[PDB]
Design a protein around this motif. Structure first.
Motif, PDB file in Angstrom:
ATOM      1  N   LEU A 163      -4.574   1.041  10.104  1.00 61.89           N
ATOM      2  CA  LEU A 163      -3.665   1.632   9.128  1.00 61.89           C
ATOM      3  C   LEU A 163      -3.945   1.105   7.726  1.00 61.89           C
ATOM      4  CD1 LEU A 163      -1.406   3.555   8.580  1.00 61.89           C
ATOM      5  CD2 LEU A 163       0.239   1.748   9.115  1.00 61.89           C
ATOM      6  N   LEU A 164      -4.285  -0.182   7.611  1.00 64.33           N
ATOM      7  CA  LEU A 164      -4.705  -0.725   6.322  1.00 64.33           C
ATOM      8  C   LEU A 164      -5.951  -0.015   5.809  1.00 64.33           C
ATOM      9  CD1 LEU A 164      -4.169  -4.546   6.966  1.00 64.33           C
ATOM     10  CD2 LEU A 164      -2.974  -3.182   5.253  1.00 64.33           C
TER      11      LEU A 164
ATOM     12  N   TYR B 202       0.822  -1.208   0.000  1.00 59.38           N
ATOM     13  CA  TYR B 202       0.000   0.000   0.000  1.00 59.38           C
ATOM     14  C   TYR B 202       0.857   1.260   0.000  1.00 59.38           C
ATOM     15  CZ  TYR B 202      -4.344  -2.594   0.786  1.00 59.38           C
ATOM     16  OH  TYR B 202      -5.433  -3.425   0.653  1.00 59.38           O
ATOM     17  N   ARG B 203       1.957   1.260   0.762  1.00 65.39           N
ATOM     18  CA  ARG B 203       2.839   2.423   0.784  1.00 65.39           C
ATOM     19  C   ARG B 203       3.446   2.678  -0.590  1.00 65.39           C
ATOM     20  NH1 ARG B 203       4.450  -0.252   5.630  1.00 65.39           N
ATOM     21  NH2 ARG B 203       3.755   0.847   7.519  1.00 65.39           N
ATOM     22  N   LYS B 204       3.754   1.610  -1.329  1.00 66.25           N
ATOM     23  CA  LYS B 204       4.328   1.775  -2.660  1.00 66.25           C
ATOM     24  C   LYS B 204       3.291   2.298  -3.647  1.00 66.25           C
ATOM     25  CE  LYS B 204       7.014  -0.696  -6.180  1.00 66.25           C
ATOM     26  NZ  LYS B 204       6.138  -0.245  -7.296  1.00 66.25           N
TER      27      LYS B 204
ATOM     28  N   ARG C 107      -6.139   2.120   2.315  1.00 63.41           N
ATOM     29  CA  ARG C 107      -7.123   1.844   1.273  1.00 63.41           C
ATOM     30  C   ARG C 107      -7.903   3.100   0.905  1.00 63.41           C
ATOM     31  NH1 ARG C 107      -7.910  -2.694   4.738  1.00 63.41           N
ATOM     32  NH2 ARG C 107      -7.117  -4.647   3.831  1.00 63.41           N
ATOM     33  N   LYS C 108      -8.186   3.953   1.892  1.00 62.85           N
ATOM     34  CA  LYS C 108      -8.920   5.184   1.615  1.00 62.85           C
ATOM     35  C   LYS C 108      -8.057   6.180   0.850  1.00 62.85           C
ATOM     36  CE  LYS C 108     -11.731   8.747   3.876  1.00 62.85           C
ATOM     37  NZ  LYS C 108     -11.033   9.865   3.183  1.00 62.85           N
ATOM     38  N   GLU C 109      -6.773   6.283   1.205  1.00 60.82           N
ATOM     39  CA  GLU C 109      -5.881   7.182   0.480  1.00 60.82           C
ATOM     40  C   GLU C 109      -5.688   6.720  -0.958  1.00 60.82           C
ATOM     41  OE1 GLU C 109      -2.221   7.881   2.524  1.00 60.82           O
ATOM     42  OE2 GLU C 109      -3.191   8.251   4.460  1.00 60.82           O
ATOM     43  N   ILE C 110      -5.528   5.410  -1.162  1.00 59.37           N
ATOM     44  CA  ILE C 110      -5.399   4.874  -2.515  1.00 59.37           C
ATOM     45  C   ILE C 110      -6.663   5.152  -3.319  1.00 59.37           C
ATOM     46  CG2 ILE C 110      -5.267   2.722  -3.828  1.00 59.37           C
ATOM     47  CD1 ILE C 110      -3.309   1.693  -1.705  1.00 59.37           C
TER      48      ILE C 110
END
Lengths: 84, 84
Positions: free
Chosen positions: B11-12, A15-17, B16-19
């Motif tokens: 944090l996951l 996810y960070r990538k 997921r929301k930021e992505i």
């Protein structure tokens, strides 16, 4: 549903990538949009630069070779035309 | 370093929301860039439409009121000018 069972650390790393790649893409597209907007303004100034001459040429032909200069002003040129 | 101690699930969920938000922004900026590119092409066609008339007007004045039509063609109009 995927049959992969990933560790929570590996998915966080993925996810960070993705977040890093998406932020890089968003800034690059935003900068390209800014450059394309400046080229768009330059095209508009050049368009208004040209039209300013045609408008003054029409005023000169109005108050009076001079004949067919008017025909060019209102001629259809490849799908475009200036109306009355 | 943040002093917050988050759960791995929280944090996951945040990632997921930021992505999701970044992908939505990237597609919106990409569609806006496509619309701005079409308006840029229209401005270029209008610029070439106008110039095509000025070029033909110059050819008409070349082979021969007609005098000051040439002066307008090569006049400086608000920081822009057509060179020799």
């Amino acid at each position: 549903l995927s049959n992969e069972v990933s560790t929570d650390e590996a998915l966080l790393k993925r996810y960070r990538k993705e977040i890093m790649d998406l932020k890089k893409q968003l800034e690059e597209v935003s900068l390209e949009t800014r450059a394309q907007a400046m080229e768009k303004d330059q095209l508009e100034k050049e368009r208004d630069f040209y039209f300013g001459k045609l408008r003054n040429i029409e005023l000169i032909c109005q108050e009076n070779v001079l004949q067919r200069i008017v025909d060019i002003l209102y001629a259809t040129d490849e799908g475009f035309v200036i109306p009355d």
